[PDB]
Amino acid sequence: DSVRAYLKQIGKVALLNAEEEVELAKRIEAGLYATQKLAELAEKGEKLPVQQRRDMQWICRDGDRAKNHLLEANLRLVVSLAKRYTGRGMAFLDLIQEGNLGLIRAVEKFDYTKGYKFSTYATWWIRQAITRAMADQARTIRIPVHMVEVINKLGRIQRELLQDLGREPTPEELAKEMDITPEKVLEIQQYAREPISLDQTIGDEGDSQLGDFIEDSEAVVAVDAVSFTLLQDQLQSVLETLSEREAGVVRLRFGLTDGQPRTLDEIGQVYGVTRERIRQIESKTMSKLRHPSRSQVLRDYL
Amino acid sequence: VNFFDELRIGLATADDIRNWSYGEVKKPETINYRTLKPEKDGLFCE
Amino acid sequence: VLRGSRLGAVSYETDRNHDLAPRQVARYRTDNGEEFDVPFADDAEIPGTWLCRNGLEGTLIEGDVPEPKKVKPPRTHWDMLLERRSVEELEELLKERLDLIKAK
Amino acid sequence: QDRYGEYFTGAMGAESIKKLIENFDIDAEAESLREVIRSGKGQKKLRAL
Amino acid sequence: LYRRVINRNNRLKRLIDLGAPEIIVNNEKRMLQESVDALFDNGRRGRPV
Amino acid sequence: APVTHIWYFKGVPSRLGYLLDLAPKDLEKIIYFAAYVITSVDDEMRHNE
DNA sequence: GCTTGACAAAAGTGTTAAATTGTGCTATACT
DNA sequence: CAATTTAACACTTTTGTCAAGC
């Protein structure tokens, strides 16, 4: 396995104890403030003496090394905490890495003045980071954290209802035990579904996988498409039978040229004409067109 | 088209890869969960 | 047989080149020195910064709109520690540690 | 590395291979292989070939 | 598969930012290499996902 | 971080493992963060001191 | 051949209110 | 929890319908 190498690596360093963590944290804080004092002096450019310069350059680097040692000491704890979420959603080593990020944050916020063990405080951040990573990255279609929590609650009460009533719980029972309307619980139910791989083995074997027998409902069908190319032409011919002005308003009103359904006011700029005359012309043209003498030609593309 | 004489293959120095691409995939998300539109800067990004 | 679909609604427009609309071309330069072009429409204003093919954000070549858009650096380790302790406590701890290395 | 960091450089992973081939002279290996082929007798000639 | 790469890659881009210890960064780089290998060949190295 | 293309690392022959004389098992350890490899050694400076 | 006034439902104004989403933090000890 | 997005509506404006006529 690719994980056993990590298990071997983490055994290099030994576990710490309370007082050791105490002076480690003290050294980290002292080194951070030493860096701050370095910056403060460098802002003025104050002459840090040669001996004090080396002493400070040692103390800060020792603080960084203490941070590294403290981080490396708790990898066993991180792995142990991450081991609880194996087998659902995310890979084991991904969970270990997210726990490592959580441990890094815990070390960032760890306080030694409290006198508390690092183990108790780390376990909060490590668990939080593992849960966040599992929620964000465990599904192809990403659902937000709140919806993930709602889905987990739905599953929990569904299992409880199944155990109690001893039967397939209808959505009404789920709603009653969740205090939510049937529609919302149904929405959560449908959201919780996982997509099925398009490369399955439908057919009991590998002759067809899944998609060799799926038809596109949005397919381009030739007979319709060609018909459309004719319809335009027919209209282009039919609108030619009308007068120049009568044909223009219909073309501009429906935008056969540009596509914009120009309002009457816009069409009023053809001659400064008011909306009412343009409406009258449009109605007259509509009466002319809908008569069988012209409409019978087009009465199949409906 | 219909003007081929031979087809050749070779390695890619990642300059060809950077030339082909129309943009890098910053994020892993594919599509929104309740709405079914693609997520920007991720897979399926428009 | 099984039936499927996408969100990509199809259109039967036959106008491959029937209609031509005006456009303007903006040019952007990336931080690494690569340059790209984008044919924007002749509408409103050209955006100051654009996400280019290489993934870096590039600035308009002409140069305008000096707005970093509300810079906000992340919480630094020192600023992250300043809450847990008082400044006087850190001064005292640093002084104590400097005594240890003085004795060495 | 601590003792003699100024004299030599080490690396691990794919970055190491990249850095190591960045200065790799292609001609030298071919010349050496040809010389071994014209010089070797047993399996060494086979490996060079 | 592609997604699996990104999740690793982005994580690496964060670990280098805050100066993580060498062990974590090496582990992340190993994960990234394995993910790319799976993307190109599932089962060539190790056991396939 | 850079990654190695699997096709040329594994396959018996290993195209990379033949381009540079590293043994097939040597590459596996270097690539998968198991063993260090010396990228460059300043021979002239070492001989000088 | 075409225009003004009286009305009307429909398409927006502008802000607020409700739902949704991203985010840091939990200190008995646990390796 | 604060930030972001979306519905919600009391109301304004653009737009479409009649009766009349210079």
UniProtKB/Swiss-Prot annotation, chain B:
Highest taxon in the source lineage: Bacteria
Spans through the membrane: none
Function recorded in the entry: DNA-dependent RNA polymerase catalyzes the transcription of DNA into RNA using the four ribonucleoside triphosphates as substrates.
Self-association state and partner proteins as the record states: The RNAP catalytic core consists of 2 alpha, 1 beta, 1 beta' and 1 omega subunit. When a sigma factor is associated with the core the holoenzyme is formed, which can initiate transcription.
Family according to the record: Belongs to the RNA polymerase beta' chain family.
The name this protein goes by in its record: DNA-directed RNA polymerase subunit beta'
Organism: Mycolicibacterium smegmatis (strain ATCC 700084 / mc(2)155)
Curated annotation (Swiss-Prot), chain C:
Induction (record text): Constitutively expressed during growth, increases slightly in stationary phase (at protein level).
Alphabetically ordered keywords of this record: Antibiotic resistance, Transcription, Transcription regulation
One term of GO molecular function: bacterial-type RNA polymerase core enzyme binding
Superkingdom of the source species: Bacteria
InterPro entries: RbpA_sf, RNApol-bd_RbpA
Gene3D superfamilies: RNA polymerase-binding protein A
Any one GO BP annotation for this protein: positive regulation of DNA-templated transcription
Pfam families linked to this entry: RbpA
Transmembrane segments annotated in the record for this chain: none
Reported function: Binds to RNA polymerase (RNAP), probably stimulating transcriptions from principal, but not alternative sigma factor promoters. Partially restores transcription in the presence of rifampicin (Rif) in vitro; overexpression leads to an increase in the Rif tolerance in vivo, with smaller colonies. Seems to act by removing Rif from its binding site and preventing its further binding. No longer stimulates transcription in Rif-resistant RNA polymerase (with mutations in rpoB).
HAMAP family: RbpA
Protein family per UniProt: Belongs to the RNA polymerase-binding protein RbpA family.
Oligomer and partners: Monomer. Forms a complex with the RNAP catalytic core, specifically with the beta subunit (RpoB); its binding site may overlap with that of Rif. May bind free principal sigma factors.
Protein name: RNA polymerase-binding protein RbpA
Organism of provenance: Mycolicibacterium smegmatis (strain ATCC 700084 / mc(2)155)
Lineage of the species this protein comes from: Bacteria, Bacillati, Actinomycetota, Actinomycetes, Mycobacteriales
Gene giving rise to this polypeptide: rbpA
